[PDB]
Symmetry: C3
């Protein structure tokens, strides 16, 4: 209920992400973060391969302050990657907690990234570039810390989103697979 | 699906080190031959596992298109399997990990580096001696490694173990043959 | 197997089993072979025969001090054959009461009692349990969280709460017990209210 894109009351559009290699220090990071600013900690999650993952939510000013305090003690270095999206896309909020496998769905891209921050930053950039739909997403858990997601829509939009992800990911991208029209035994449920 | 419709005795198994590359291989395998895609599942250690089912000619043709895409870049195929006529016991152990509750004896436990090594050796072992497949865990939860257990007569399970040895080659991590399990362990080997 | 096997105190009529023995093996098949030698050698109660993350096998057993010690000897003999598959090993003659309910499944606390807290992070499961038991019988602390290998690639962690002096006193003991097996040891003097009780979610 705290992952809702729309609150019933204060509005929290900003999304702060912290990916750490130490679970212990990862908790230390969370303390200092919520100390300097009243952000809303979305999750404190020990994940696959032993990494720790922090997600926070709040106003732009609140999140920004918590992230600065987080970085300073993160090297006092166990900080793997960071992400701050002042205005996260609405389709992205429901793909933060549990690994979502799509039920039923044309064209699709499959983005394979090295870190969790790379995935969330890539899906977001693509969701606000072309009218595409985020179908699946898995973050670190069960897949050795790696991350992947899928984006569906018209062919041209899928291609457009492919170049967007390819740019802001950089060396964090492992492979991007673009299929114009998958088989009927793939259309709908890509993972089973 | 994972049972034992036209008879589809052939089993194709693909271990791809990339989940993105994996879903591309699955699309290429089906567009060149009408196999039944049993599995498209990301497993532990960030690997991707593909399992297909069809006639020997269907699978054979699908795996050709698979190996073309799997090595298209700079390599992404960890291991592969192609069993024209897989044993009947081997089918209900492919979907999810199976733990035996109790036995009906000796036992052999095989630890393999890849999943393709496990299913291949289990297939070979089953066809050489009256052994019963009991447990099997593939990649998930154990960093990509795979294992299984076989039971039966002492001389029989040791005849099956020698077959596992050869079919695995360097993919064999460990083989254990317990002639007479302790009574508190007969059945539930994992708890 | 009786679900009450992890209970710190068995009912009246059941034998006393205060000792604890833990085995970490790099091989799962070898792990089964080792467990076989354990129960055959001595009548110890096998707590778990469990494969976990990083592909290692996890074994725990309980019984009288003389029994578990006898099973552990036969364990090390088999686990070390050829090239030893044994990664680490623990033997506690009288494991602390609080320690028992954390062995089986991962446990996350949902509340505290009024304030400091330490978070220990080890490389092996044995290093975690051994570090927890020593602290609990050194300082008046309370074990809140613990996770053994599963979901974190073989690593392990636990949390201890209490007064700042108590968690400090239970810090350098963990360091001496862990040795090189310790990764990171965090300490928090005054945790924020939002983190009090619920550290993992």
């Amino acid at each position: 209920e705290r992952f809702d894109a729309t609150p019933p009351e204060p509005d929290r559009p900003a999304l702060g992400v912290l990916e750490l290699t130490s679970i212990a220090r990862g908790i230390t990071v969370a303390d200092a973060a919520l100390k300097r600013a009243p952000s809303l900690l979305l999750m404190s999650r020990p994940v696959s391969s032993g990494k720790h993952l922090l997600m926070m939510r709040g106003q732009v000013a609140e999140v920004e302050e918590s992230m600065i305090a987080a970085r300073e003690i993160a090297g006092a270095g166990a900080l793997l990657d960071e992400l701050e999206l002042p205005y996260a896309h609405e389709q992205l909020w429901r793909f933060l907690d549990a690994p979502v496998v799509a039920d039923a769905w044309e064209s699709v891209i499959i983005v394979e990234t090295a870190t969790v921050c790379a995935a969330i930053d890539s899906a977001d950039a693509a969701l606000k570039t072309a009218p595409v739909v985020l179908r699946d997403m898995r973050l670190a858990i069960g897949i050795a810390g790696k991350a992947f997601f899928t984006l569906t829509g018209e062919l041209a939009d899928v291609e457009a989103a492919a170049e967007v992800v390819r740019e802001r990911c950089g060396a964090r991208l492992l492979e991007l697979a673009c299929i114009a029209r998958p088989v009927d035994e793939l259309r709908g449920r890509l993972f089973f």
